Specification:
The chain is an alpha+beta fold. Helices cover 19% and strands 22% of the residues. This is Pierisin.
C-alpha cells in the first residue's frame, strides 16, 4: 500500500526523514511478543472509513480534544510535546504512547464515528476545544496493534511530528460541555468534496484571525 506518512508534520527534522526511519523510531522498542503479532500500519492514501465509505486519507474527519485555544492552535498547528532532534527512545515509541500517553513526538487524534466521537473523561468540564482535522498520512494505532491495542475505543490516529495548521478546518469551543462558537480556520487547505461543518443554527460561526478577542479562552494554569 501507499501512504502520505509524515507529510502533515510541523517538526521539520521529522518531516525531512524517510518513512523507513520514522517507522524504525516508532517500532524499535516494541516487545518481541508484540513485534511477532504486530506491524506498523500507516493510514493508506485510500482507506475504508468508519461508515464503510472509501475515502482519500485527507477526507477522513479526525478530531482532537485540546484545552489550548485557536489563537495558539490555528497559528501554530499541533506541535508535539517533544520536538528535539535527538529524542529518547521513550519519546518516539508508538506503543508506550498509545498505552500511557507520556511526553512524545506524537499528536493524538481520533476518527469520527459516522453513523459520534470518543470523548475524554473531563470533556464536559472547563473550557475545551474539539478541533476538526483533515490531514494526510499518520499512523493507524488499532490496525498497527490489532487486539493488543491498549485503548481501541480511542480509534486513534497518531501524527509523529504533529499536524500543520493548514489541515485544521474548524474548532468547537465548549464551556462546561456546552458549545459557544464554531471557529473557522481561514488558512485551511480545502481538499474539496467535504461535508459542510456540523452546526446548529443557534451556534455562531466565527472566522478566526490572529489574536482574535474571543480566541484565547482557556482554563487557568
Amino acid at each position: 500500500y501507499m501512504t502520505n506518512g509524515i507529510q502533515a508534520a510541523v517538526v521539520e527534522w521529522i518531516r525531512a526523514l524517510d518513512l523507513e526511519i520514522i517507522s524504525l523510531l516508532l517500532s524499535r522498542a516494541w516487545p518481541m511478543a508484540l513485534l511477532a503479532t504486530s506491524e506498523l500500519r500507516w493510514r493508506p492514501t485510500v482507506l475504508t472509513d468508519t461508515d464503510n465509505v472509501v475515502r482519500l486519507d485527507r477526507r477522513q474527519r479526525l478530531v482532537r480534544w485540546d484545552r489550548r485555544p485557536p489563537n495558539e492552535i490555528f497559528l501554530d498547528g499541533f506541535v508535539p510535546i517533544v520536538t528535539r532532534e535527538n529524542p529518547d527512545w521513550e519519546e518516539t515509541d508508538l506503543y508506550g504512547f498509545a498505552k500511557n500517553n507520556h511526553p512524545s513526538i506524537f499528536v493524538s487524534t481520533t476518527k469520527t464515528q459516522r453513523n459520534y466521537v470518543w470523548t475524554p473523561r473531563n470533556a464536559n468540564r472547563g473550557i475545551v476545544y474539539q478541533y476538526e482535522i483533515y490531514a494526510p498520512g499518520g499512523v493507524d494505532v488499532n490496525d498497527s496493534f490489532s487486539d493488543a491495542s491498549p485503548w481501541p475505543n480511542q480509534m486513534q490516529v497518531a501524527f509523529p511530528g504533529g499536524i500543520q495548521n493548514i489541515y485544521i478546518r474548524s474548532a468547537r469551543e465548549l464551556h462546561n460541555g456546552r458549545i459557544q462558537r464554531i471557529w473557522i480556520n481561514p488558512n485551511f487547505l480545502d481538499p474539496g468534496d467535504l461535508e459542510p461543518i456540523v452546526s446548529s443554527s443557534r451556534t455562531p460561526q466565527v472566522i478566526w484571525r490572529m489574536n482574535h478577542p474571543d480566541g484565547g479562552h482557556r482554563d487557568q494554569r
